[PDB]
Amino acid sequence: KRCLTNNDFNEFIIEYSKGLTLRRRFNQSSDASQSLVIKRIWTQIENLL
C-alpha cells in the first residue's frame, strides 16, 4: 500500500525495505527452510520489481 502511494516515500520503499531489509536478512542470514519468510522477501522482490 505504501508503494503506489507517494514515492513510496521513497522511504516507504527505501527505509521500509531498509528496516525490512533487516528482517529480509532474517530471511537472508539463514533461510532453511522458511518458505514463509522466503515468501515474504519473495513478494518484497516482486513488488520492488
Partner 1 sequence: ESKEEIKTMENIDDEVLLEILTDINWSIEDDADSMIERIDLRLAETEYLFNQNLLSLQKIGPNIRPYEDKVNDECHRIIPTLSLFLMEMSNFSNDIENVESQDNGLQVESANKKLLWNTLDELLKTVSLDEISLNQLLECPIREKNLPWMENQLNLLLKAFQAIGSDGNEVEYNLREISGLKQRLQFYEKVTKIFLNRIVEEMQKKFSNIRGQDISHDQMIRILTTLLIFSPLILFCKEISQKSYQAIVENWNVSIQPVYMELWTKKISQLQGIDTNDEKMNELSLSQLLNEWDTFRKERKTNDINPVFKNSFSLLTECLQTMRQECIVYQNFVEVFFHISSKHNFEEYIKHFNDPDAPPILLDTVKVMQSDREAAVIETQLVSRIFQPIVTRLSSYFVELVKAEPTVAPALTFYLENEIKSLESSNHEFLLSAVTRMYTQIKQVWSDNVEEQVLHFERISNATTNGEILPGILDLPVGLKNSEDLFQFAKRSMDIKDTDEGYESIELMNSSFRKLSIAATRSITDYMETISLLVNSNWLTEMLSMDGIFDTSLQNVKKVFDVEKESYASFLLRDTMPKLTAFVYGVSNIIENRQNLENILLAYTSHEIETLVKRLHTHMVNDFGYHQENAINNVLCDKLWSCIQGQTVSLYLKLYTVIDKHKNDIISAFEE
For partner 1, the binding residue among 5, 6, 7, 30 (CB under 8 A) is 30
33-36 — which CB contacts under 8 Å span 24+ positions?
Answer: none
* Residue 44 binding partner 1, by CB under 8 A: no
User: Which residues lie closer than 8 Å to 24 by C-beta, 6 or more apart?
Assistant: 17, 40, 41, 44
Alpha carbon distance 31, 7 (integer Å): 30
For partner 1, the binding residue among 5, 9, 39, 42 (CB under 8 A) is 39
Nearer to partner 1, 7 or 18 (CB): 18
**Where does this chain bind partner 1 (CB under 8 A)?**
15, 18-19, 21-23, 25-37, 39
